Design a protein around this nucleic acid. Structure first.
Ligand SMILES: [Mg+2]
Ligand SMILES: [Mg+2]
Lengths: 172, 177
DNA sequence: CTCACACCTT
DNA sequence: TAAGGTGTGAG
């Protein structure tokens, strides 16, 4: 647990964070943008670990976007326990995980409470916090939370500034 | 370090074999056994926050029948679980390691409108208590003892749990044979 | 599922 | 002490 985790593309995340990050969620499931990726150090090279993500409510509010601003508009909806996204390389050695960027870019977000594909179910107009968890594969694990990756789940982009950012930052 | 050891593990296992139930009430109910741990491997001078939460063990709703728990439906959706921060937090590693860390005063309630800061559970659902350890100068670590999982109930279902509670909890001494 | 209650601990 | 944690058992 003397492990360090570093958010990749932090500057891009910050730009989105300043505006107020939104992530589109759909029936088919949508990848996050920015992608969530991390560098990890301090793992035992030979020990096996499972790396995984979840995405948990950031608060108890429900939100609306109006007058180019977000604001609380109600009580957050109750939900089922969040699904986990287990990194596909799991389980793997500390040396494997440390050798290059651990990317969670294939993680998908859906708004379909009946989703059959294992995608992470969110509710529109709620705020969420992505978390990374590191488990010795072998009762104990550690969790890393970057506040700048927090976001509001949306059904289509609300703040037109976000749309510009996404447009300006994806080659194709 | 960091290592966390469950106190009275033997007693927990006795309940766990039968299938642990924890009473929940409006006023808030202590767990029995008391959740207590020994911790080692902390930096003696560093300050830490210790806290617990209690999370759904699965997505099921249960029923008890034929002297057996069995799945009966989908679990009820719920709000995020409240935290119980240990009263001594924040404290130094040395403080935490000096004696058992007790979470005896943690209370469980069924009142979704509870104003007392107690942990809100739904009856007939299964739950897993977890201990978290947060350091000082984002990152924290979590310890999960599966032998402490339990089904929240409004009154005891399996009479073997009732008898265990009576035999081992001092406050129930008056009901003993 | 709830409450007044006897009986007990701390 | 006095305050407060138990399961009870009828409703
Ligand atoms: Mg990206
Ligand atoms: Mg104990």
């Amino acid at each position: 647990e003397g492990i360090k985790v570093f958010l990749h593309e932090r500057e891009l995340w910050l730009k989105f964070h300043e505006v107020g990050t939104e992530m589109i969620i759909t029936k088919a499931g949508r990848r996050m943008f920015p992608s969530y990726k991390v560098k990890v150090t301090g793992l035992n090279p030979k020990t096996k670990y499972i790396l995984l993500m979840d995405i948990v409510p950031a608060d108890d509010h429900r939100y609306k976007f109006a007058d180019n601003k977000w604001s609380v508009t109600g009580k957050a909806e109750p939900a089922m326990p969040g699904r986990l996204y287990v990194h596909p390389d799991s389980p793997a050695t500390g040396a494997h995980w440390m050798r290059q960027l651990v990317s969670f870019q294939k993680l998908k977000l859906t708004n379909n409470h009946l989703d059959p594909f294992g995608h992470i179910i969110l509710n529109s107009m709620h705020k969420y916090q992505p978390r990374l968890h590191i488990v010795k594969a072998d009762t104990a694990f550690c969790t890393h939370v970057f506040p700048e990756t927090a976001f509001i789940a949306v059904t289509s982009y609300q703040n037109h500034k976000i749309t510009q950012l996404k447009i300006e930052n994806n080659p194709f």
